[PDB]
Amino acid sequence: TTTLAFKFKDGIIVAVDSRASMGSFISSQNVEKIIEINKNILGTMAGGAADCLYWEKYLGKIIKIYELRNNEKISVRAASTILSNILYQYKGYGLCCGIILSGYDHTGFNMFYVDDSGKKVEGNLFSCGSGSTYAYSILDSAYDYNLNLDQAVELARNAIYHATFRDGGSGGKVRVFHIHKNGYDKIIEGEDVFDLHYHYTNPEQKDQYVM
Amino acid sequence: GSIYNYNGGCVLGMSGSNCVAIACDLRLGANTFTTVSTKFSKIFKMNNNVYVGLSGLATDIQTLYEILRYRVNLYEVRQDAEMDVECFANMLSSILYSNRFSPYFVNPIVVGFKLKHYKVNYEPYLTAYDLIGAKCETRDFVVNGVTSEQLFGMCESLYVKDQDENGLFETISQCLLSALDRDCISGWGAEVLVLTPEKIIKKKLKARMD
Amino acid sequence: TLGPVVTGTSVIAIKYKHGIMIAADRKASYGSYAKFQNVERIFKINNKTVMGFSGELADAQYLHELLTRKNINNLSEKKRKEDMYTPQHYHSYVSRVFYVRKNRIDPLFNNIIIAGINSQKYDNNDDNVLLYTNKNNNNEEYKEIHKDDLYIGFVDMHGTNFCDDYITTGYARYFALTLLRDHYKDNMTEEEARILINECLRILYFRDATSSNFIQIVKVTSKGVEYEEPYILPCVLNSADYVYPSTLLPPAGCMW
Amino acid sequence: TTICGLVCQNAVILGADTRATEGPIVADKNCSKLHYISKNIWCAGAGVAGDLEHTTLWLQHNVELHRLNTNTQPRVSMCVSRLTQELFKYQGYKVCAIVLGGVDVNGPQLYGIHPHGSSCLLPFTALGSGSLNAMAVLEAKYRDNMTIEEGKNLVCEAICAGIFNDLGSGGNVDICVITKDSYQHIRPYKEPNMRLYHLPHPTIYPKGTTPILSEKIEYIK
Amino acid sequence: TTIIGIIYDNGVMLACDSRTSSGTFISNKCSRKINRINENLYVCRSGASAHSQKIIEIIKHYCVSMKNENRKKGRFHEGETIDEEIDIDSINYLDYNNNNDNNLVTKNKYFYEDKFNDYNPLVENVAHITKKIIYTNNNFLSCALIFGGYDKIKKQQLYAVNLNGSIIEKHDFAVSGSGSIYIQSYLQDKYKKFMTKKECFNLILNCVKYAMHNDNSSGGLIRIVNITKSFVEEFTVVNTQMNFQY
Amino acid sequence: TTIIGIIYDNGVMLACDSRTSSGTFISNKCSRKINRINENLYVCRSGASAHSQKIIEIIKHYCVSMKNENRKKGRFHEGETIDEEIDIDSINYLDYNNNNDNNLVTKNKYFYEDKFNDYNPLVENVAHITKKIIYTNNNFLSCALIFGGYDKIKKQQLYAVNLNGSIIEKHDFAVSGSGSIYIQSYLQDKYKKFMTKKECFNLILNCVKYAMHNDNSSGGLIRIVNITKSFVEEFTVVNTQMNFQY
Amino acid sequence: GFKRWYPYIDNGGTVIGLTGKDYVILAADTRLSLSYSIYTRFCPKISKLTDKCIIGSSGMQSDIKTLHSLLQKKIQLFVLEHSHYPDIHVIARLLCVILYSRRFFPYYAFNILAGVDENNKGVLYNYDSVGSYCEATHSCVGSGSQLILPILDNRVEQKNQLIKNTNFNLGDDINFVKDAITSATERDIYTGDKTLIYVIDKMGINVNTLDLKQD
Amino acid sequence: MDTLIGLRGNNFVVLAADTYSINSIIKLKNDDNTKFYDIHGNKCLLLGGSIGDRLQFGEFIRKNVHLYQYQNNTDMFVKSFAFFTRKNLAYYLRRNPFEVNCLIAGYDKKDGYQLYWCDYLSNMDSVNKGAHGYGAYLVSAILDKYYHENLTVDEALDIFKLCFEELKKRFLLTQINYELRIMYDNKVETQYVTV
Ligand SMILES: O=C(NC1CCCC1)[C@@H]1CCCCOc2cccc(c2)C[C@H](N2CCCC2=O)C(=O)N[C@@H](CCN2CCOCC2)C(=O)N1
Ligand SMILES: O=C(NC1CCCC1)[C@@H]1CCCCOc2cccc(c2)C[C@H](N2CCCC2=O)C(=O)N[C@@H](CCN2CCOCC2)C(=O)N1
Ligand SMILES: O=C(NC1CCCC1)[C@@H]1CCCCOc2cccc(c2)C[C@H](N2CCCC2=O)C(=O)N[C@@H](CCN2CCOCC2)C(=O)N1
């Protein structure tokens, strides 16, 4: 698994791969690792599939109730606090959850990393999963807050591609969503990394690439 | 068990009519999920009629290949002839068993031609091993490596008796690629060698790289 | 219970043309010690249902108590013979008990067979049930019962449950079951069923250390549940090579 | 695995299934489990495949050496002594459960050898994962002084019991009959298992369907 | 397993069950736990089958070496000039098995070649070399043995080689195996000095029968070997079932 | 520990050794393993001492409750009107101990208060409530019990409550403890139906004596309780040594 | 002492699913095994949930039976409380929550949900033991899954074939399911005896059988 | 952990490592010299792992290769050197293992510029780029992304600088001192870099 998100001048880019594994066997290549928490908050899934799915859907329910009760939109910080408290309550039980919560609210664009150990870290750039070190290195090497939407999407795609290239746990399709003031757009619904390799690393397609 | 997951990889042998094919993935893993190489061939030529595919722990692959090359070269220089594929297969079994209690962590296959000298007839020859040298002589296909179950399914479903060289190539390549697409720790390229008594065709497949 | 201490070995139950024939040797062992040699291992639940067990005797007695009182309460509420619980009902109940105990990691260390007649149309025994009197021990004849009306269920420690025409537990799952899958047939007479069961029990006596040759046979038929008179099974060796003296073989080498 | 043997009139009959497993997967569907030791001595093997292959090969070649050096008919007792001593030397870590049978000056003999080195002279026996099923059949139906045809039928029935009731067994039934003057290895003898459903047409991939990156042709001689 | 030895007035009798099991499964119904070492020297095996078998094979080899080394040079005995049979058939008669298998050899008897006991190894010597072998490797070997035999010095003798490689000579009876614990007091109560052949045979047979009745690890058939100064008799008993009035 | 029960023609006899040990050390030389539950209901204790003691205390309390609940209202039996001695002194005579301790009470006898068995709990009921208690906590409790008693329904009875909380009724004899394994076949061979009081007493005493001879965990003295329809007799035997001709 | 009893056992077997445009195929073998012995040759692994939805499972048979019966109970209760039958998607979410309720003492069951939604789309959901689930066009659970899933990938997706096939239909799909299960039976010791092939399409649920090898 | 990085081009090979000597929680030195083992004849062995094992294995290899070259009065081929190294490591793997990771580089006329990647299990393959240590996770993708054939030495050094900045910024151990070995144009040069 490789998920990532970063702020830039037009909002937040969120990109993920789509592989699911059972041990070393590939259970699926079409799983959806970006979960809409509400109209303005997206969640990414890394780690246990059931844990991420269940607790992000549970957070969605909590936030729906909150926003009905108080007639206002929850903040990303509050959503992340709720999730981190819920997960910390299960410490030692063995939950495997790596989650990035990104969204827009009245305080602007926000991004938090929440893991099963209760960690809750505000930031502007995160990556989770087995492939996250590769995505980190690519992003840090080529990250500028003043990138336009096209550049930001291209960078996210390239980072996901390199992660899936080096990490056996990541692969399938790259999805790149864009979060903005009025919700989010799916710039790249799903693009097989197969084409990405023969587009970036070996466009000649005349012999096997050598690492 | 996990030792075999350290590197990953797999090998596959198949026979047609007067032809035989051997294929492998090209990945060198490390720590079960890090790909460090994409040109690490598991296929080794002992002589023109004898190939061996060695999957498993890469250090043991290289070590066993060197031992086998030493033994084959000595045998052939002493005898002044090419080693018969069956003699080589039995020798490989004996070498693996000689380490019965501290074995090489390898999953070999042997693919080649058994020559029946009258004119000469070339009978495809296939054998799969376990790490202590138990042997499985077969006529259709052999598999080994962490991808063994997927290769077994693909071969049982798709193998076709008495295919010509092109049909053999398409079949073995499809079996290998489909099997690899379901493995997290194998793939990153495929080499396919199709053997005939007259020529060897070496192909690299445009495979998945994730 | 943390593990078996006093155990019974194996039970065999098969459908034949007049109902169920279930068998078990009357033995309960304390490890390799054959402490109890006259133990009942097949219990009557009601006039149409029996319970056999292998494994721990204390757990089996507990389950037998549960079912005894369940049948009593069933009879307490009965207004017509159709109200009596079927063998299928008791099999479901036992499978449920086992499943619940598995989920607590507190299983009964038994394999259970629940067998009987799944219909009320073959007789009027359940019209006036006698718990403490038996009239079978009059000169009527057995009715052939369609196999579909007969029930033989199995429950193991993990709650695995299924039904079949013949069920075995313990070592009978290897020795008896092989011969049954080869040789059982529908609508067997009491003679043929008894002969096949006896062949299975003879093999078990020769090959299962926990088994004995003192066999209790129970029948569930149109006349109800009948306990046959326990009998000793005659088991003779099937080769003179066994009985040949060792001194008549060569004195040299590994001759033994 | 299911291997079994019995003694009949002036003959020993061995039988085996042909499945080899690697975990829950069938690795070889037609592996041979009956091993030629000498013209009058065969053996059937269950346990670890590599151990069986190499132990039976070593035994066969040492027996031939002994026969050449003494110019006498090999004895089944010699195979028992050699095999049991080897297996005992390895304290059961050489997992070889072997049914050894043959005919010599002491008549037809059959031994059940166990990986720890024990042996037992028997009129019949079965070994392997299916040995309980085969032993059920043999105990039910064995008799002294059976004819060779009756013995063959019984051995086949016992192996089939193992094949159909034990997941570790399967494939065909192989049989060998060992008399004083020769043996008869029948492989397969039964063939009770075949693929039932076949697709109406075998999938033939059109030429050029697989994408390739590079190709080189290298001729030979 | 049950193995017994009893010394009686004119010899020593060895008896055994025949069951070999691996857990609850009976791998061998009728093993042969009483093995001839020399023409007048037998051993009853208990414990792990592989261990006792390989030990006994080694001991047989050692006994051949000793015997041939005991042979003196020359000729001897240029002048020296050197009981009620058990009704085995009636012991083995059962109503439901009468001529069901007519061909059945349940008895054998042979005479000693070394009539004067000129070279046969002493029972004590063979027993002690066995004890030595077991003791030297008692970190791995687990088997208990009973040696019975006749030599011209000490006459009929019993030696128990216990687990861990200790040796004790018995002058009345010896018992070993998981089944003998059950017949311990029965044998103690019924044994007397200078028993006849008939009394000893009946007693040893009943001991094995009771042990088989009570011990799941024992069963099969009963093999009885009787060792006298001039001959050895062996019997097989297949009527093993025990009938209680109550 | 050895505990035995034997049913004879006119009653049931319970016997026991008296040794309690902590490893190889004998913490109590003469414990009391046969305990009165009701005037006609005794239990023989085996297993861990604390377990059997606390179980029996609970059972005695339960038995008092049952007995007083069994009392029917009113008056009954307005008309109803309701064997060779054991020479215990001669059993207990030893040459080297004659008047060495004159004051020694080795016997006691008492008659039942509930002559008609109007309210005494059934032996089966008490045994089964005990089985229930043991089974409910059979993850922790390790003790085997023999119940012997007399009630007007089933007469003299033996119930074995085995380890893990199973119950079996015995109609001839019951044995438990590490010492009984040795006398298993001795008792099986010597027991017959409808024994006299004298025969039963001699047999049970000899069983305990043999078990003490063979089992290190058994020893001390022998306590024998005889339960009839009208009275209970208790004996102590201190002559426990076993003399073998051989 | 006594070892702690393990509360799990794999009873073996395979379940295979394959969607079409207007149909779904769910097939399962019927062997019931325990270690290397066969409890019975006929233990169906597919239960009907609704007229348009079935469930097939592999794993511990006691768990599968309890879970199928619990799901049937919950669905009948839903029908009584809410006056309508739940769609396949509703049942999928419900099964997810049921499985996750035992996240820490899981059911040993791998379950495929098969059905056709209101739009007459063939639907498949496949699950892990703790409630993770995903929608798929073909899936397989059980001992034979790692043998069968590559074959169905090759036939259905054709990702590694330049000359593709786009003529899919019910008869060919059923033939592919039968070939896949037979090929699995060839190699997986726990799959065999007999297979039940369920087909859901416009009319409803139809059942057919195919014989597998017995060894 | 010891971060090792190697990059080979058509005309060069570059190796790089952190310059830290670590004893538990303290840095013994910020200018470690126990990682690079220059070997006569345009060859270089770079090692990571425990300092003791590094010193032992590296000096053993260097001395044996120098012995070979003095005895045969010739330079060992780079490939021969790599496989001799791998075989010695594999010999000791099952007897008394050297827990060391290796990058092997060199030039010779037969094969040009060569880079071999070998791990502590003696798994080896020739590569165009490679890394060892925990920092491999953070530099490998950069190596992949910015590498191409026909890269110049200056371009490769810029790639290495990218790697060093990423290690300083994102790696838990903030490594900022590095040493590089550059082989090209029949000369071996040493550089030190601080980020
Ligand atoms: O890919 C995955 N994460 C990515 C995909 C989505 C989000 C990111 C993880 C990768 C490993 C997760 C480790 O943490 C666990 C937490 C709890 C349980 C288990 C593992 C064991 C469980 N196992 C093992 C065998 C039997 C079983 O139930 C199991 O590995 N489950 C698979 C689910 C795969 N599919 C199920 C249905 O379809 C959708 C996904 C799973 O969680 N994988
Ligand atoms: O069927 C079998 N015996 C019969 C078949 C013919 C003769 C009798 C056994 C059945 C199970 C025994 C497994 O206990 C082992 C103990 C120690 C070592 C190994 C196995 C080695 C190895 N192991 C162990 C796990 C990883 C691995 O690889 C392994 O499982 N060997 C397989 C055969 C391997 N293949 C060789 C070539 O192709 C045919 C099969 C094997 O011996 N099976
Ligand atoms: O050149 C050699 N001999 C010279 C050195 C002294 C005088 C002559 C021989 C070469 C013979 C080639 C035959 O093929 C093999 C035959 C048997 C075994 C192995 C290979 C694999 C074994 N392997 C592989 C990795 C782990 C392991 O144990 C291994 O290579 N053994 C080394 C001995 C290595 N030590 C010898 C003394 O020097 C220090 C190292 C070995 O046999 N060398």
Numbering used by the authors:
A (entry chain Z): 1 to 211
B (entry chain J): 2 to 119, 127 to 218
C (entry chain b): 2 to 138, 147 to 265
D (entry chain I): 1 to 221
E (entry chain H), F (entry chain V): 1 to 82, 89 to 252
G (entry chain a): 26 to 240
H (entry chain K): 1 to 195
Authors' account:
Unfolded peptide substrates must pass through the antechamber before reaching the catalytic chamber for degradation. We recently developed a macrocyclic peptide, TDI-8304, that is highly selective for Pf20S over human proteasomes and is potent in vitro and in vivo against P. falciparum.
Using highly enriched Pf20S purified from Pf NF54 pellets, we determined the cryo-EM structure of the TDI-8304-bound complex at an average resolution of 2.18 Å. The EM densities of all six TDI-8304 molecules were well resolved for unambiguous atomic modeling. No TDI-8304 density was observed in any β1 catalytic pocket, even when the EM map was displayed at a low threshold. TDI-8304 binds to the β5 subunit with the P1 cyclopentyl group projecting into the S1 pocket and the P3 morpholino group inserting into the S3 pocket. The main chain of the cyclic peptide-like inhibitor binds to the substrate cleft in an antiparallel β-sheet mode, forming an extensive hydrogen bonding network with Ser21, Gly47, and Ala49 of β5 and the side chain of Asp153 of β6. The TDI-8304 pyrrolidinone forms two hydrogen bonds with the β6 Ser154 to further enhance the affinity. Importantly, TDI-8304 also makes extensive contact with several hydrophobic residues including Ala20, Met22, Met45, Gly48, and Ala49 of β5 and Phe135, Val155, and Cys159 of β6. The macrocyclic ring of TDI-8304 fits snugly in an alcove formed by the α3, β3, and β4 subunits, with the P1 cyclopentyl and P3 morpholino groups partially exposed to the solvent in the antechamber.
